Amino acid sequence: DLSQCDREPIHLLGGIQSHGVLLAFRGPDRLLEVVSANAQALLGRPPETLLGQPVGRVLPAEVLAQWEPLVARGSVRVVLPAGAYRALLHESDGLTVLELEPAELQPGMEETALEVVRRLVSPLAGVKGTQALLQTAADTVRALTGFDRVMVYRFDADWHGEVLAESKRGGMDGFLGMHFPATDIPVQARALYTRNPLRLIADARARPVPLLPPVVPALGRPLDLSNSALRSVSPVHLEYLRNMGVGASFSLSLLKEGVLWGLIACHHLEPLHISHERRRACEVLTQLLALQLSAEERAAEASEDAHRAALLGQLATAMGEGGTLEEVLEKESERVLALTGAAGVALLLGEEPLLVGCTPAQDEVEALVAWLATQPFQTSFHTDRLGTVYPPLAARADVAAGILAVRLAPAAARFAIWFRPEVARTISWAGNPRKPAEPEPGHQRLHPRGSFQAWEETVRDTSLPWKRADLGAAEGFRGALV
Amino acid sequence: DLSQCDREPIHLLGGIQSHGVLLAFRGPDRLLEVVSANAQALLGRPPETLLGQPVGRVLPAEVLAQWEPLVARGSVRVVLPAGAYRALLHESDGLTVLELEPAELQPGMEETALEVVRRLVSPLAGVKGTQALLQTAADTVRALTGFDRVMVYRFDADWHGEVLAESKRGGMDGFLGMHFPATDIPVQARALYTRNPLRLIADARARPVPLLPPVVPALGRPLDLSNSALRSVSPVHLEYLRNMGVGASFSLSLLKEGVLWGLIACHHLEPLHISHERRRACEVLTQLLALQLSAEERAAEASEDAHRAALLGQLATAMGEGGTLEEVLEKESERVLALTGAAGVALLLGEEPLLVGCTPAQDEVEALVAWLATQPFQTSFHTDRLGTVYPPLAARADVAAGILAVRLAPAAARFAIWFRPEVARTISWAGNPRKPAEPEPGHQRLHPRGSFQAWEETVRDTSLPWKRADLGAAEGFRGALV
Ligand SMILES: *C/C=C1/C(Cc2[nH]c(Cc3[nH]c(CC4=NC(=O)C(CC)=C4C)c(C)c3CCC(=O)O)c(CCC(=O)O)c2C)=NC(=O)[C@H]1C
Ligand SMILES: *C/C=C1/C(Cc2[nH]c(Cc3[nH]c(CC4=NC(=O)C(CC)=C4C)c(C)c3CCC(=O)O)c(CCC(=O)O)c2C)=NC(=O)[C@H]1C
């Protein structure tokens, strides 16, 4: 359901965090437009008094010698008097949208950047599992701008997610597993994160600094601050960090192969401005955690599912050295079930079902086969919820939560079914998940929580996943019968 | 092993590069021992002299201050009065080796490194090929190194290689798709190069500078320069360089899962010296693109299995729809001969066989299974020189030159089979391959072929190799047949 929580724009609010400068430009012969009410304190002359007038009479020679490499490169460092801000410029609704914002004072990005990477590459990064690859990234990021807590929120099936990492300092608090809503990182803001990686909260305590004039004439609405460098997050959100205990939040959204995945949150007690160069060079590492995952699952599967095929190679030679189904299936029944980490498996070979392992009762399975053949799957049908699809076997979960249809022939409702049982799973949650926001009596403008502390729910009457292998190994048996 | 090549003790041969200095520090109260002649270019007062003499008492105030940090971390910025060197160390052979050699002049090296780390990582990497993956790392290490010429070398099965890639400037002779031995980078140096990636040969033409006392006092044989940098090499190496038009060297070891997948050599038309932060920065780039293309191997594997399944999904419905095999194999005759990507199949499912593609005769089919029972193999026999191992039916250059066994029945003479033809594959041999290196009347000392010109080896009659996933679509077919 689209919510007042997800219908809400970003991109086109009010403007930029109180530490940049947006000086706009409309068409040919340069010429300023949408400015930034804070502009008369890093320039030299007030905003309203150069909102009509061209670049010649707005910027100093510095940035106007640099104007050419700017277009031509992306960003470009200029050391004009207040210090040495950035330059990052893109294209908007009809504009050249030049902004600067402070630059990096240490000459050990390059140096600390290159020792920090080596960690999250190495001669062989996967050694002691994937809680390391998650934990070294989360570490580095922390130990590459400095922070007092950072994790790896991962989204799942229903876009709700949890933190599989945690790097911290001498006795804060901090989350870990600890599920928290999907409403949070809403539909708006991972549709937008496919194209725009990271966001900087500079000083979550401090207030947003408007834009000039609040619309960009021609269009009618305000400016697309979407590709922005310093978009200011939103009331729904800082209302919702001033509880938590962040004066920051440093995110760099993952996506190895076009698909989102997680984030790396970075938290910090006191306002903190990491740079564009450092912001982007941890985007380089978020880009090295997404890759080295791609590589190992895309591997695991390869290395894991040989163990699968050595089952099916057992199950097939026995199958042809004394051809006799029931006899040869019994001895290699530990193998059948174990194809798929299963407890039970019926087979309909024409005659009566050969129930085999630790399955439910025959009178039951007969009703289960009619109900199947009167469903659509072109070959297979599985679920981790069971009672949800075919309620009759709800009550007797304990062996019946997840199944593998594998139609042996067309009209023939002969097949085999793999019963997979029931799993505990006491599952932690940051405040009661049943309610992830705060309606003000009319329900039109709302709030977050001030909650964030371990309300457990208990996933149960579900099972395990059915990961490409079960559903693939299993389709080996069905071609191995015909 | 064999000819004088896999003999040359290429770490105990004294000698060291002349820009560098490797001196050695023996015993407890850090106390000199072996110093590398030209050591008074950096200490005014002679090597000969202070082979006695405590550590700090032989080398400067400057460099003493920073004797502390390089124990802990082992790379310092000791900046002295002769363009300030820096010394990486390591403990070779029970004593401590300080390896004074030059700076990075230029403070981008790191900031530039980091940006070519991006070009070869940006999350659409390989979307004009693996080929394009190799030919980036070509132009990126090149930019790091200046070096006029970069290469990339895979060591195909028999240790002897190809140069997939290249990356030259203009009017630069080059081996684009050219092809040569693995005598060269021999037995010795593969074994050494698993242990350290890199090696430099900057001023090839520059003869070595002895390091006294020819042989390490209490051992004999020269110290052991194995895990040094500013060493030299088996002389008659930069030997077969003066036979080229190169006066430098840089070549890394791409290591992929711990086997040596080869190296990238950048050599220069005239001498050049790159740093040890700078060569760290390309050894870094090797253990990165390996991380990438390890995934790309794993990827097009899982994409090609999941392919073959879908192909076999169809196959086994033609199976279950009825008709006996011979009728089912009629059209799927087309589909099975595409299931190991071979020309035809032959059943032999008891009775007189099925020839059912572009097969040899009936009489030669049977001639194999006779012999195929004599020799080993539980389940399989994929060979490609099916005429070397087995001459009689070793003239089929057209119909069969690589066969595939499977036993449809354990201890029984029932094997189904897919033969596939000779394929002419033009090989642009670079120099003579009947001349790795012509010796001196004596056969006691070797210098190496002085002519690297294209040679034709048009190899009549083998198979396109037997790719894992292909190969792997056999244990199944055999299970889902009786
Ligand atoms: C329903 C509307 C609401 C909004 C709007 C809104 N939500 C977000 C996202 C968000 N929420 C979190 C919470 C959080 N604390 C942690 O420790 C972690 C990781 C472990 C998380 C995810 C985060 C981190 C985020 C976005 C990541 C970030 O802070 O950069 C946004 C994103 C701001 C944007 O526009 O980019 C917005 C606009 N917040 C609500 O509570 C509801 C009402
Ligand atoms: C029969 C004796 C022979 C030896 C002994 C030997 N040579 C080397 C050095 C070597 N060779 C290669 C191969 C190679 N890399 C390239 O780029 C090219 C041309 C494109 C070639 C042909 C390499 C990489 C090396 C290491 C240094 C270098 O090549 O730049 C060794 C080990 C090297 C060392 O001394 O440390 C040994 C033991 N080599 C022969 O070719 C024959 C004559």
Q: What is the 3-state secondary structure (H, E, C) of A225-250?
A: CCCCCCECCCHHHHCCCCCCCCCCEE
> What phi-psi label fits residue B304: left (phi over 0), alpha (psi between -120 and 50 degrees) or beta?
alpha
How far does CA A11 lie from the centroid of its chain?
20
Q: Decide: residue B419, CB within 10 A, 0-12 exposed, 13-18 middle, 19+ buried.
A: buried
Q: Which tokens hold the place of B97?
A: 């080796």
| Nearest neighbour of A287 by CB, restricted to B107, B123, B476 | B123
Ligand positioned closest to the Cα atom of B165:
2
CA angle (A430, A459, A3) in 5-degree steps: 55
Q: Decide: residue A201, CB within 10 A, 0-12 exposed, 13-18 middle, 19+ buried.
A: buried
Closest CA to B26 of B51, B48, B49: B51
Q: Which amino acid is at B326?
A: E
Q: Decide: residue A343, CB within 10 A, 0-12 exposed, 13-18 middle, 19+ buried.
A: middle
The CA distance from A259 to A154, in Å, is 12
Phi, psi of A68 (to 5 degrees): -75, -60
The CA distance from B68 to B73, in Å, is 9
The answer to whether the beta carbons of residues A230 and A19 sit under 8 Å apart is: yes
- DSSP category for residue B66: T
Interchain contact A313–B (C-beta under 8 A) = yes
Whole-angstrom CA distances from A35 to A38, A225, A227 are 8, 12, 16
Closest CA to B189 of B179, B177, B201, B173: B201
The CA distance from B83 to B129, in Å, is 44
Which strand (E) or helix (H) includes residue B118? helix B109-119
The CA distance from B389 to B405, in Å, is 15
SS3 of chain A: the string is CCCHHHHCCCCCCCCEECCCECCCCCCCCCCCCCCCCCCCCCCCCCCHHHCCCCHHHCCCHHHHHCHHHHHHHCCCCCCCCCCCCCCCECCCCCCCCECECCCCCCCCHHHHHHHHHHHCCCCCCCCCCHHHHHHHHHHHHHHHHCCCCECCEEEECCCEEEECCCECCCCCCCCCEEEECCCCCCCHHHHCCCCCCEEEECCCCCCEECCCCCCCCCCCCCCCCCCCCCECCCHHHHCCCCCCCCCCEEEECCCCCCCCCECCCECCCCCCCCCHHHHHHHHHHHHHHCHHHHHHHHHHHHHHHHHHHHHHHHHHHHHHCCCCHHHHHHHCHHHHHHHCCCCEEEECCCCCCCCCCCCCCHHHHHHHHHHHHCCCCCCEECCCCCCCCCHHHCCCCCCCCECCEECCCCCCCCCEEEEECCCCCCECECCCCCCCCEECCCCCCEECCCCCCCCCECCCCCCCCCCCCHHHHHHHHHHCCC
| Nearest neighbour of A298 by CB, restricted to B123, B299, B315 | B299
| Nearest neighbour of B107 by CB, restricted to A107, A317, A379 | A107
Q: Tally A–B CB contacts below 8 A.
A: 115
- DSSP category for residue B442: T
The reply to whether omega before A376 is within 30° of 0 (cis) is: no
3-state secondary structure of B29: coil
Q: What is the CA radius of gyration of chain B?
A: 29
Q: Which amino acid is at A188?
A: Q
Taking each helix axis from N to C end, the angle separating A276-289 and A291-317, rounded to the nearest 10 degrees, works out to: 0
- DSSP category for residue B386: T
The CA distance from B10 to A192, in Å, is 58
The answer to whether the beta carbons of residues B455 and B388 sit under 8 Å apart is: no
How many Cα atoms are found within 13 Å in the side-chain-facing hemisphere of B394? Answer: 10
How far does CA A368 lie from the centroid of its chain?
37
The answer to whether the beta carbons of residues A16 and A22 sit under 8 Å apart is: yes
The CA distance from B146 to B438, in Å, is 33
- DSSP category for residue B153: B
The answer to whether the beta carbons of residues B78 and B63 sit under 8 Å apart is: yes
Nearest residue (CA) to ligand 2, atom 19? B265
Q: Which of residues 227-246 of A touch B (CB under 8 A)?
A: none
The CA distance from A267 to A247, in Å, is 8
CA angle (A109, A115, A120) in 5-degree steps: 110
Show the beta-strand stretches assigned E in B68-170: 96-100, 161-162
The answer to whether the beta carbons of residues B98 and B23 sit under 8 Å apart is: yes
| Nearest neighbour of A408 by CB, restricted to B121, B301, B320 | B320
Q: Which residues contact B241 (CB under 8 A, 6 or more apart)?
A: B201, B204, B247, B249, B267
- DSSP category for residue B409: S
Task: Report CB contact under 8 Å: A312, B475.
Answer: yes
3-state secondary structure of B403: strand
CA angle (B474, B475, B476) in 5-degree steps: 80
Would you say the CB of residue B3 lies under 6 angstroms from ligand 2?
yes
Q: Which tokens hold the place of B167?
A: 């990356």
Between the CA of A211 and the centroid of ligand 2 the distance, in Å, is 65
The CA distance from A4 to A445, in Å, is 8
Instruction: Report the first-to-last Cα separation within chain A, whole angstroms.
Output: 45
Ligand positioned closest to the Cα atom of B147:
2
Q: Which tokens hold the place of A69?
A: 């490499």
- DSSP category for residue B342: -
Closest CA to A481 of A411, A416, A404, A418: A416
Whole-angstrom CA distances from A104 to A79, A86, A110, A277, B317 are 11, 9, 11, 7, 65
Using most ligand atoms within 8 A of CB, pick from A150, A178, A185, A286 the residue to mutate for ligand 1. Answer: A185
The answer to whether the beta carbons of residues B67 and B61 sit under 8 Å apart is: no
Whole-angstrom CA distances from A342 to A339, A459, A466, A470 are 7, 20, 11, 10
The answer to whether the beta carbons of residues B266 and B137 sit under 8 Å apart is: no
Task: Report CB contact under 8 Å: A312, B479.
Answer: yes
How many Å lie between the alpha carbon of B481 and the closest alpha carbon of chain A?
Answer: 7
How far does CA B90 lie from the centroid of its chain?
26
Tokens 């072109």 belong to: A378
Phi, psi of B154 (to 5 degrees): -90, 145
CA angle (B116, B118, B120) in 5-degree steps: 75
The answer to whether the beta carbons of residues A397 and A422 sit under 8 Å apart is: yes
Task: Report CB contact under 8 Å: A118, B476.
Answer: no
The CA distance from B185 to A329, in Å, is 55
Task: Note the resolution in Å, 1 decimal.
Answer: 2.4
The CA distance from A266 to A271, in Å, is 12
The CA distance from B98 to B89, in Å, is 5
Strands B161-162 and B96-100: unpaired
Residue B154's CB: how many other CB atoms inside 10 A? 15
The answer to whether the beta carbons of residues B406 and B477 sit under 8 Å apart is: yes
Q: What is the DSSP string of B245-306?
A: T----EE--EEEBTEEEEB-EE--SS-----SSTTHHHHHHHHHHHHHHHHHHHHHHHHHHH
Closest CA to A320 of B357, B138, B411: B411
Using most ligand atoms within 8 A of CB, pick from B4, B185, B250 the residue to mutate for ligand 2. Answer: B185
Q: What is the DSSP string of B164-229?
A: ----B-SS----TT-EE-SSSS-HHHHHHHHH----B-TTTTS-----SSSS-TTT-S----TT-S
The CA distance from B120 to A470, in Å, is 36
The CA distance from B402 to B419, in Å, is 6
Q: Which of residues 9-48 of A touch B (CB under 8 A)?
A: none
Q: Which of residues 104-123 of A touch B (CB under 8 A)?
A: 107, 109-111, 113-114, 117-118, 121-123
**Four-point Cα dihedral B94, B72, B68, B17, nearest 10:** 60
3-state secondary structure of B64: helix
Chain A positions in Cβ-Cβ contact with residue B320 (cut-off 8 Å): 408-410, 482
Q: Decide: residue A110, CB within 10 A, 0-12 exposed, 13-18 middle, 19+ buried.
A: buried
Phi, psi of B142 (to 5 degrees): -55, -50
Tokens 């490499």 belong to: A69
The CA distance from B146 to B142, in Å, is 6
Residue B122's CB: how many other CB atoms inside 10 A? 10
How many Cα atoms are found within 13 Å in the side-chain-facing hemisphere of A262? Answer: 20
Which strand (E) or helix (H) includes residue B73? none
Ligand positioned closest to the Cα atom of B266:
2
Whole-angstrom CA distances from B80 to A391, B64, B92, B106, B151 are 82, 11, 25, 17, 37
The answer to whether the beta carbons of residues B108 and B116 sit under 8 Å apart is: no
The answer to whether the beta carbons of residues B412 and B452 sit under 8 Å apart is: no
Closest CA to B427 of B458, B385, B463: B458
Tokens 């934990």 belong to: A135
The CA distance from B285 to B134, in Å, is 12
Tokens 């300092």 belong to: A169
The CA distance from B206 to A223, in Å, is 64
The CA distance from A449 to A29, in Å, is 50
Q: Which residues contact A245 (CB under 8 A, 6 or more apart)?
A: A173, A267, A269
Using the atom order of ligand 1, give the atom closest to the CA of residue A199.
30
Tokens 């630059």 belong to: A103
Q: Which residues contact B377 (CB under 8 A, 6 or more apart)?
A: B405
Whole-angstrom CA distances from A374 to A99, A370, A381 are 62, 6, 12
Q: Which residues contact B220 (CB under 8 A, 6 or more apart)?
A: none
Nearest residue (CA) to ligand 1, atom 25? A185
How many Cα atoms are found within 13 Å in the side-chain-facing hemisphere of A331? Answer: 12
Taking each helix axis from N to C end, the angle separating A130-145 and A276-289, rounded to the nearest 10 degrees, works out to: 170
Interchain contact B412–A (C-beta under 8 A) = no
